[PDB]
Write a protein that binds this ligand. Sequence first.
Ligand SMILES: Cc1c(C(=O)N[C@@H](CCC2CC2)C(=O)Nc2ccccc2)[nH]c2c1C(=O)CC(C)(C)C2
Ligand SMILES: Cc1c(C(=O)N[C@@H](CCC2CC2)C(=O)Nc2ccccc2)[nH]c2c1C(=O)CC(C)(C)C2
Ligand SMILES: Nc1ncnc2c1ncn2[C@@H]1O[C@H](C[C@@H](N)CC[C@H](N)C(=O)O)[C@@H](O)[C@H]1O
Ligand SMILES: Nc1ncnc2c1ncn2[C@@H]1O[C@H](C[C@@H](N)CC[C@H](N)C(=O)O)[C@@H](O)[C@H]1O
Ligand SMILES: [Cl-]
Ligand SMILES: [Zn+2]
Ligand SMILES: [Zn+2]
Ligand SMILES: [Zn+2]
Ligand SMILES: [Zn+2]
Ligand SMILES: [Zn+2]
Ligand SMILES: [Zn+2]
Ligand SMILES: [Zn+2]
Ligand SMILES: [Zn+2]
Lengths: 270, 268
Amino acid sequence: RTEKIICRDVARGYENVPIPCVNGVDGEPCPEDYKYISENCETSTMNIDRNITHLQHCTCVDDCSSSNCLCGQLSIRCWYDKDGRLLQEFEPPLIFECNQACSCWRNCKNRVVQSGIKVRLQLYRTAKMGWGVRALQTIPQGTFICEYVGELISDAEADVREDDSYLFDLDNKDGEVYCIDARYYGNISRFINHLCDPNIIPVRVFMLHQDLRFPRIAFFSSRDIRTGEELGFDYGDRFWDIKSKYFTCQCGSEKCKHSAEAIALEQSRL
Amino acid sequence: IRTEKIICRDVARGYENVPIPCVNGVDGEPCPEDYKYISENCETSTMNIDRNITHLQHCTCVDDCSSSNCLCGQLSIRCWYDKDGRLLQEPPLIFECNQACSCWRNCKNRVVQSGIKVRLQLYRTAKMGWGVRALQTIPQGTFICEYVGELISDAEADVREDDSYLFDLDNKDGEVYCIDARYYGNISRFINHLCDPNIIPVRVFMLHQDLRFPRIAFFSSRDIRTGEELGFDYGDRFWDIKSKYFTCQCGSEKCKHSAEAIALEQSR
Ligand SMILES: Cc1c(C(=O)N[C@@H](CCC2CC2)C(=O)Nc2ccccc2)[nH]c2c1C(=O)CC(C)(C)C2
Ligand SMILES: Cc1c(C(=O)N[C@@H](CCC2CC2)C(=O)Nc2ccccc2)[nH]c2c1C(=O)CC(C)(C)C2
Ligand SMILES: Nc1ncnc2c1ncn2[C@@H]1O[C@H](C[C@@H](N)CC[C@H](N)C(=O)O)[C@@H](O)[C@H]1O
Ligand SMILES: Nc1ncnc2c1ncn2[C@@H]1O[C@H](C[C@@H](N)CC[C@H](N)C(=O)O)[C@@H](O)[C@H]1O
Ligand SMILES: [Cl-]
Ligand SMILES: [Zn+2]
Ligand SMILES: [Zn+2]
Ligand SMILES: [Zn+2]
Ligand SMILES: [Zn+2]
Ligand SMILES: [Zn+2]
Ligand SMILES: [Zn+2]
Ligand SMILES: [Zn+2]
Ligand SMILES: [Zn+2]
């Protein structure tokens, strides 16, 4: 079967690079049951707090490469190297990027996620998991890949929605909990599958606002990724505790944690 | 004889598509720093701008939105864009395409949201403080820049001390809002008044359609040559207030607000 190129760019020119779609597996058409958006949207009043006087910001007169940058100090257990790659000390990490209130320039060293997608990605048809996303180039460890983009909703709204296959919990620790639902509006990340041996990790980030209800979700590679490799992250135990009643994991890894056999083995261990 | 110094390579600190340098060949005034340069409008208290994506009128085009079937073009009042992104023209009102439209980000109805493309310079004028001039030929109808600043209510505008950078959105229907570029603004805060203007402000909607908050886009009203100072007609309301404190220095043969013009109007 020929691998048919079925869309030149599912993002319609909204990303820095096109994201084509191919299907060399079956007759499924390019997915159109959602609206591609490159940035989060709202379908009710969220009214993000963008008060420029509310932003913590730096006074750097350099490129924000020094440890004296306030924005770098606010970041929790992570930092960017000179090439824009994320390093972590391993409480989850939290990135405060520079913003419109900082004295620094738009091209300072603390601007990775807000600068958008730089790697070549492809939406493709997987053998067993529906659509997936793969790299069209080698990607070094720590590289920004893409953001989890969708519809901002409250946790109460997330609990009542019927299709939970695209729901990302922001897991707010101080205040009400919010979610990003990519079922109806989303970007390329809605197609990233779960892998028990993941090669990307989600990290919460603040950029042009510091409204604590709404960290933005940035995926970074957790190891060097080879051309053609499917991208995947660990959806987490909570997802699988709910979804395993309907389907089990087909990642195929020797260390798979969510297959029918793994679940039975975990039930025996407990 | 003073010669011109380049005193800032980019007053926008990299936030625009192009650098906007500042020069001074007139006096010793340093690069203006009594404001914060921002490339897009800000809030210091919330305006509750309606950003609900389901409230956007949007088109179903899959071409470049150049056809008469484009709903977004049909919404725009008394104006349209040509194939080169230039504006042709009750004041006009532009509805650009947005994130709800089915078209691509590079369609023909995206001029203002795509940002500054012409080369501009902040420079020290002889008699009007800082001004902005063209560094290139700018054909008639070309987008120049947006009037960017702090969104404030009419009540807040009334109590503000310095109104030299206050732009009234002229909401003819309901709630009244202003853009104050005194404390936060972009290059447009430095554009002076000309009685022979060469740019015009146009109200535009892009990523939201909250009709209380049109964004203000400047387009050239004629072909502009390199070195010409950019200027719009601030309007009679500004001058009815300000002429008691200073008169117009634009130098036009048909200046409407000079000491000479004021003396004639008082003679009547
Ligand atoms: C993986 C993750 C989550 C997270 O929501 N996963 C999702 C699964 C992935 C989503 C694409 C589909 C999830 O559980 N959906 C769900 C839960 C219950 C019922 C239905 C769906 N939220 C955080 C993480 C983190 O790793 C750290 C964090 C601080 C960024 C917080
Ligand atoms: C020129 C203009 C305005 C407008 O606010 N001018 C300003 C002057 C220019 C501003 C940089 C300083 C103004 O009056 N300031 C003012 C008045 C009184 C006291 C203090 C300051 N508002 C519209 C226009 C239009 O041409 C049409 C429009 C629909 C875009 C609506
Ligand atoms: N490891 C996995 N094993 C089995 N199914 C998966 C796995 N990862 C993702 N899926 C499927 O993909 C859904 C999650 C979506 N966010 C991912 C894109 C999805 N594959 C699609 O075609 O739209 C899940 O609810 C499953 O249907
Ligand atoms: N035609 C003019 N004649 C005299 N002063 C002007 C004229 N146009 C603008 N100005 C001055 O500039 C102010 C408006 C500002 N938005 C323009 C930038 C200002 N020239 C500056 O140096 O900051 C007015 O309040 C005046 O002080
Ligand atoms: Cl330059
Ligand atoms: Zn800094
Ligand atoms: Zn910085
Ligand atoms: Zn900073
Ligand atoms: Zn697995
Ligand atoms: Zn259209
Ligand atoms: Zn369009
Ligand atoms: Zn449109
Ligand atoms: Zn004049």
